[PDB]
Amino acid sequence: FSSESDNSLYFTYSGQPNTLEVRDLNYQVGIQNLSFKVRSGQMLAIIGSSGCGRASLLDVITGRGHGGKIKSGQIWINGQPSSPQLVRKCVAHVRQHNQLLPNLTVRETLAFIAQMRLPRTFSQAQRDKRVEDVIAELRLRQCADTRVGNMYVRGLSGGERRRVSIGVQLLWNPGILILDEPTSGLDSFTAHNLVKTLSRLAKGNRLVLISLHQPRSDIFRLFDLVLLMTSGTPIYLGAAQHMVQYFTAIGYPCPRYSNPADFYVDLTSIDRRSREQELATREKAQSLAALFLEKVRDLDDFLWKTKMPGAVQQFTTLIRRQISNDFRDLPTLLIHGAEACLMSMTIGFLYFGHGSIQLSFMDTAALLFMIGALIPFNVILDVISKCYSERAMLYYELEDGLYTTGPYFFAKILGELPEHCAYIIIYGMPTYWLANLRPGLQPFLLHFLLVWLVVFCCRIMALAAAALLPTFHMASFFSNALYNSFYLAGGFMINLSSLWTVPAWISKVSFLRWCFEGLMKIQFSRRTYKMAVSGDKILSVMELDSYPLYAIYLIVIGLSGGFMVLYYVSLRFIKQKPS
């Protein structure tokens, strides 16, 4: 046996029992002809193939699939035709692959979700009450205070992660809970205990639907109802413990000491190795389907024998969660710091200006260009890498609708500033000090501010690119193409006046050009440089006399604002599909 323990219920659904029914649904990619009705208190497992390309049956039922469309039939939820609003208000979909933030605790993870799902009229005591009820129901009081981390591997077990993934859906008290592959990656005992947990959730006035391919013997015995499919064609719908009798009474026995789910699935499976076998097996499957439809023709249900949080509160919650998670992730912060410091020290030492012969004009200009141009190399890769790692969470959270793109947009941009500013300090200050650049507070501060704005613009560009292209490598390619274009158009490597129309237009919007020109108008503004030679004419010769320094700052701000508009439109209009 496995294990017996407390089977009490702690968090039950308080509303009227809900229903879900499907009437002659025909979906092609797909699903040929399904009819069923289930009610609160039952648990329906779906076994066999049952799906379609890149979308399971449960995604078809919730009305959010891909690569196909519903051709006929109806889906009804709580007596009403299915719609995106009924799905959002009733269906707690738990996906096969999602992630929780690595460095929050269970209490913190549930607390942040609770703040974003429960009505704004709840007091904090009521939200803490709800979180504790969910923790009690899922048997998480022991290990409630540990890390939910996946990337942080040390922490709570995979079973407990699965339970937390269920809890973040249970918090808003759903009536219909739908799970896709709940026992995936779990051990035998863990999967068994998880299925019993799902049974208790069903017991507490809820409807639970489970998509489960190839269930084990001991898991099959725990099922209340089972829907057996070979393809989109159903074979049997009804009580799991009577499934064998159904087949035995229609001429297809099953041996003792053979799992019913595996044997029947293999018996009705449609091999495509040859045309003769595929033809014979499709004919067999259609015969069994017609036979079932006849068997339950005269039997009912085809079964054999509140104000929400506003944008500001959502923003506040997202910014606190983002800052809380990333500032506990110390290895990444140390790596980013170490890379910025080592790079700034190498640039500083190469252009060292204290214990040496004073830097030439052209060496100083090369230095200022290198200070600007050599930074995006790491910034682009880490912003794109981080954005791609977060698409699963963003996609499913926006799909569920606990927040809109506005609060996420602002929280995402603002949350990197406590790391960005430290990064700018570490990168900026050792080069300005090691290479003997212009003394005084005002040059130093103007240099720092210009570098800060340019790197910010770079981050917004990479952020907009990562959210626009469907994959990591295409977004990386696009970002490097813009970076290399801006680099060449920067005006140091090639002359700005000796340009064809389109490179001139590229130079006009190149943030590395404005970075270079600004730094040059700080180091050589009104200072006399020993070559004496007036700085103003020297800047004029290189065609850097026009556009006063404040306009350079405004232009960099404008370019960042442009990429912000692109990023916002990108996220809202184009879906951030995972992987």
Epitope: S8, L9, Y10, F11, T12, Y13, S14, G15, Q16, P17, G41, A125, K129, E132, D133, A136, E137, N173, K203, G204, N205
Partner: antibody, heavy 122, light 108 residues
Framework: QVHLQQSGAELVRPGTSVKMSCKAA????????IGWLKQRPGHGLEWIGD????????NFNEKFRDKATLTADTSSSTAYMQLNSLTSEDSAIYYC???????????????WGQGTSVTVSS | DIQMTQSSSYLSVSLGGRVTITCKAS??????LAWYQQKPGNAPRLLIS???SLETGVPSRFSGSGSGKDYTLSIISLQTEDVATYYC?????????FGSGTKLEIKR
């Protein structure tokens, strides 16, 4: 108005069984958790168990698992409790009560019944 | 199980005075402690929900608090009607447990 109305007093012989009732009014009885409590003179109160009528689920106090059977008839909004194999130590006042929370985990019994005296004596 | 213990089963008080009734838990109950007032012949009335939250309809004379595992019910300006048996009950974890009760009496 929320109100719980219990059965009258009872007097039975040892070895027999009794069945008490608690009719609820003023709320959606079916989906709320209702609990039962024993008050034995000379002592405090003892928790017997909680019952969830829509599903028929019982949260047991292990002391009373083999003695008190809890049930309900949702078509008449009445909870019942049956006491089996009575002895002299089961003579007490029994109460039914409902919780503040429609969800069931917090035993803050907002509304209470009247008490059903049970006397066991030959 | 978590045992709730109420010492001082009788407190001799006078009308118009101050009464403090204590109760300690054998384990962490996370402030999920209710207080009940029972008079002879009547079913108990709930006075306090979670440790400090006063129930609707209960006079402002009643209050409560706690720290760690030690909780107190206080009554300011004790009335004749407030002479009753008070119970401490925890709902953190099943089985639910009640204290032994304390009873007030008029000092003579």
């Amino acid at each position: 108005q929320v109100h719980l109305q219990q059965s009258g007093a009872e007097l039975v012989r040892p070895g027999t069984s009794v069945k008490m009732s608690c009719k609820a009014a003023g709320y959606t009885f079916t989906y709320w958790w209702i609990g039962w409590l024993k008050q034995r003179p000379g002592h405090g109160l003892e928790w017997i168990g909680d019952f969830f009528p829509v599903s028929g689920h019982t949260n047991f106090n292990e002391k009373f698992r083999d003695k008190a059977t809890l049930t309900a008839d949702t078509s008449s909004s009445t909870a019942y409790m049956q006491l089996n194999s009575l002895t002299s130590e089961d003579s007490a006042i029994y109460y039914c009560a409902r919780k503040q929370d429609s969800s069931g985990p917090l035993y803050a019994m907002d509304y209470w019944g009247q008490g059903t005296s049970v006397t066991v004596s030959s | 199980d978590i045992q709730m213990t109420q010492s001082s089963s009788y407190l001799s008080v006078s009308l118009g005075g101050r009464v403090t009734i204590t109760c300690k838990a054998s384990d962490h109950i996370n402030n999920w402690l209710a207080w009940y007032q029972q008079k002879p012949g009547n079913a108990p009335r709930l006075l306090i929900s979670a440790a400090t939250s006063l129930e609707t309809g209960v006079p402002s004379r009643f209050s409560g608090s706690g720290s760690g595992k030690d909780y107190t019910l206080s009554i300011i300006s004790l009335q004749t009607e407030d002479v009753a048996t008070y119970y401490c009950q925890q709902y953190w974890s099943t089985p639910f447990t009640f204290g032994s009760g304390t009873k007030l009496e008029i000092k003579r």
